[PDB]
Design a protein around this ligand. Sequence first.
Ligand code: CUA
Ligand code: CUA
Ligand SMILES: [Ca+2]
Ligand SMILES: [Ca+2]
Ligand SMILES: [Cl-]
Ligand SMILES: [Cl-]
Ligand SMILES: [K+]
Ligand SMILES: [K+]
Lengths: 581, 581
Amino acid sequence: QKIHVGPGELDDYYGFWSGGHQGEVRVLGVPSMRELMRIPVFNVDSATGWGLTNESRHIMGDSAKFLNGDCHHPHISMTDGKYDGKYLFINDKANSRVARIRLDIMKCDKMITVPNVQAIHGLRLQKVPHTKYVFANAEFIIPHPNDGKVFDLQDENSYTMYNAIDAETMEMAFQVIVDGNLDNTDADYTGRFAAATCYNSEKAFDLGGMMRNERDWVVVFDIHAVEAAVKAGDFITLGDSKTPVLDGRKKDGKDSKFTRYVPVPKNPHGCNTSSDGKYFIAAGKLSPTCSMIAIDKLPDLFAGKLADPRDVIVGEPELGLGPLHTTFDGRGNAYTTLFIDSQVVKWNMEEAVRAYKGEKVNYIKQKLDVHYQPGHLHASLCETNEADGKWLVALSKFSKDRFLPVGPLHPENDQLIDISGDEMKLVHDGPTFAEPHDCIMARRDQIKTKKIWDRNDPFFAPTVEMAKKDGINLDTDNKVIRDGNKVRVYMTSMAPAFGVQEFTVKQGDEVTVTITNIDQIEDVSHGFVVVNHGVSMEISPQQTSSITFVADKPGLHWYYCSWFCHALHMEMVGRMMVEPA
Amino acid sequence: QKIHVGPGELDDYYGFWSGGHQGEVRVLGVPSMRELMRIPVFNVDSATGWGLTNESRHIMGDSAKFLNGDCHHPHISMTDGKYDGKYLFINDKANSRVARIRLDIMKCDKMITVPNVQAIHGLRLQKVPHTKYVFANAEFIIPHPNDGKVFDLQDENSYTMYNAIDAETMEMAFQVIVDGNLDNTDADYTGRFAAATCYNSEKAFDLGGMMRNERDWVVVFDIHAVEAAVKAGDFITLGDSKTPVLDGRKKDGKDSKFTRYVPVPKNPHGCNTSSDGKYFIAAGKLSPTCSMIAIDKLPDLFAGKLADPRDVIVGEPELGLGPLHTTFDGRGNAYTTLFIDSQVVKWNMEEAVRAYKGEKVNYIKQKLDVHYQPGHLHASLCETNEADGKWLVALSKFSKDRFLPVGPLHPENDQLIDISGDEMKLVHDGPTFAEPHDCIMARRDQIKTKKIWDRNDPFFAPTVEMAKKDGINLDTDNKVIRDGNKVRVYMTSMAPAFGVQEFTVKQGDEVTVTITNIDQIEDVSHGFVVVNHGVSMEISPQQTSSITFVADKPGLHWYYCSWFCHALHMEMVGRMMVEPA
Ligand code: CUA
Ligand code: CUA
Ligand SMILES: [Ca+2]
Ligand SMILES: [Ca+2]
Ligand SMILES: [Cl-]
Ligand SMILES: [Cl-]
Ligand SMILES: [K+]
Ligand SMILES: [K+]
């Protein structure tokens, strides 16, 4: 199978990698494993001015004050259990956010901070009938209200919540209070059920305490029952949030009608739905197993028709040491990372189910050594009913000697594995920065990208609205609007000249520069940097970008195009002249 | 030759890429072209906390307020015209800086704002007898003083300057005023001479006016004469800067002792010393030529033995449309980018010289089409007398259709070219983010990196010193020091436990957390992230890092390790508890 993409040739799949602790999203070509684009999300990017521009800061809201993020889980919007290629969503663990990327422009266009929670970790998407909800985990137990009066985790009102976000609006839709905590999550192929893993059912703060129970659980959610309760107006609110809050804890040994708790050993981690829709598969982590829950049996569990919640367990196969995550080939095989054994294990799901019933059978097909200590793994289209069993990426945490020494900080090793055959063949070691935990692959024909910006694009629609209030037509105009010590420069840009090449202001004036790239040629980006003022942004073809800064320094100050756009690029410059105070 | 590095195999060269206007430095393996490591410099890195930690902000001094940078020209220190692998230096055009990276730890350790200039662009290093000076071009003409009294570029005191920095101390060494401006620069193989290109001899501000005269110049500096005058006290200063400033402007048609101006067509760009040390070669940009200055002849120019400045020009080969940069194979051939023709032209230098002298020889050997619009190119070891003629990287600005569509903003195309034989051949297309401009390659055996940190490392020595004062032994202690409204947490970390797992502070306190990674095994890095507090940092084996922030939010606040360090990493957490107002 394939492997080398020589000059002129194109990759077959897009990869969307999390940037990890660095905070961005990265687009790669598969199987070349080359990075094609960096998508700034929670990081501040000097190149594009994400985190610096008015458009980007507006999307971020108040969280624009944070220079950091921590992502793990990129996921693509679906329709009928199939990628529709409209949206990618990703978590921020550091500052408790969920972000949307529009796959047509390859930019983050929505960002929300989840209210009344701490640490958005696990995140996956509703599959069916489509991605109406972004389900997202809040990992850490906190007091409610968190005012510094109560610190106890055991306190009745100390808990965390499972979060649902409207995918289209990017507003909270509801929250569910749970016992224990939440790690990872996934969703069924009907839209009625979602599940999440929990490693801290003990509600402990110390290391030994979190490991005390032999089993924790995966909590199952009846999303339909939840929605009906929100609709009937049976919910509460907390503090300053309008978000409907539902109670999915167990009261006095009896289930809330929103949730079921299926005990699972031990500090489980991964929570993955098989591509046939049959199973939620929890990776056992401290237990050398996966637990297979049958979605088939879930209606009966919620209709109180099953004696023990363990009855929905249909398979609990032994796999090896340190199972973290599971993916699928769409041929009936599951593939699990074993962190401690440092392997990917390939196993037949339906044979494990047989084994659980006592049938004598070898469900393990193969173990492949990886280098080293795999966390997540991802097989192409695994999260869809179209899982194609072609490629597998295993993202390993310790690269040791697999790449040249680069000092005491090492890269992660994301290894491309051929899975189209009976035998898994390691094909490529891919060094990556700042620990992408997980990734997702899409067919090339599943992604449709704008070649150039449309002038009515929502991304800078507010900046367009500001321009009309000024009677400024962005497509044509090159003017300076003055309003107190506010200065609003509006300009066209065209390789190799700025539409406005000089302007004068007073020391202390607040300057906003709005640039519209009127070039029609694809790939002709411009940039705008103001020297010694910490101002930098990108303006791609047919885009409008704006940036606000203070001219605290008197004198002549140069602004230049940062993007090489033309033979006379070095000369694409202008002058801001600041009068003394 | 080569091309493919498979699993378990290692690259043959280190590549060091400028991150462009993204702001960082990137480490690659050649010939795989894979990104092994990112070294944050002018960017804020959320992963390692560069820009957030006290160690980094201290290195950045006052400029730590800037979140942006624009880097172009990475260069490795040399000893007797050969790489010595101690430091890499890089410019920042956007905020007028020069950074130093220690190649043993792959971190930026020193950073200077260059006084009284605007935009540090061109940069190269003294070659022989070693890298004593870092030379850097300030590109834009500004008034002196720059206080908003004069804006006219034609004024007696409106000018830019050439800069010399002591490579070891990272202090200013001297500055030389020049006419016109400064684009790129290189140095000879003796230490006496340096050269720079100028494209704005007209001192205009508009596009047409910068293209006014058919020639500008390269300006040659006599570093020995400059050093002679500085120690003979003969220098001026500008404002509050101690930096010795010398005048290299032409007076009334008469030269200064420090410079000579050699007319060159037209808006010349790249300035490159050949590997035999015979030529400063300037790429012609608007002239379809390059210009060859015989370094041989510079002593007679400066001594007044030569009739006219053009006498040091021993070659002006016609090469094609829009020459930008030149590199060398160490076989007598030069390789020049043609931005307009989109080609690398390979040519024989000695033959070009003989063709300027009259002889009719075809000095052009080959033209290779590149994709598309190349800027810089770099041949392996080209800046040393060991130029090995094996690899060539042409860094092109328009990727067009060469990679998968990823939206309106396109990657750059950095193309690996095999030049070890007689014919240049294109072997690999490497997509890169944010316009890397230039890059430098080094033999594997030229770089030596630390596997773990030394406890006594200068990088965090100030933090060690501060620890003494509080009475703290960093290798062992887990303490909290109260000092008014300032709390100073010291802790060791050892997978998978923080040394301090909870602390309590009062609303409003200034909390400094200092972490020392006492793990002994390589690659066992830890992280530190305070949830919803914009706090994030790396701590690698044997390192001490510190971050300061304001606990302004009452309640329970989780901190967690961001770097996957152990099987129980998810559980490597801690609590900050904040006592109400
Ligand atoms: Cu616009 Cu370079
Ligand atoms: Cu320490 Cu993860
Ligand atoms: Ca547990
Ligand atoms: Ca000129
Ligand atoms: Cl998962
Ligand atoms: Cl150059
Ligand atoms: K690591
Ligand atoms: K480009």
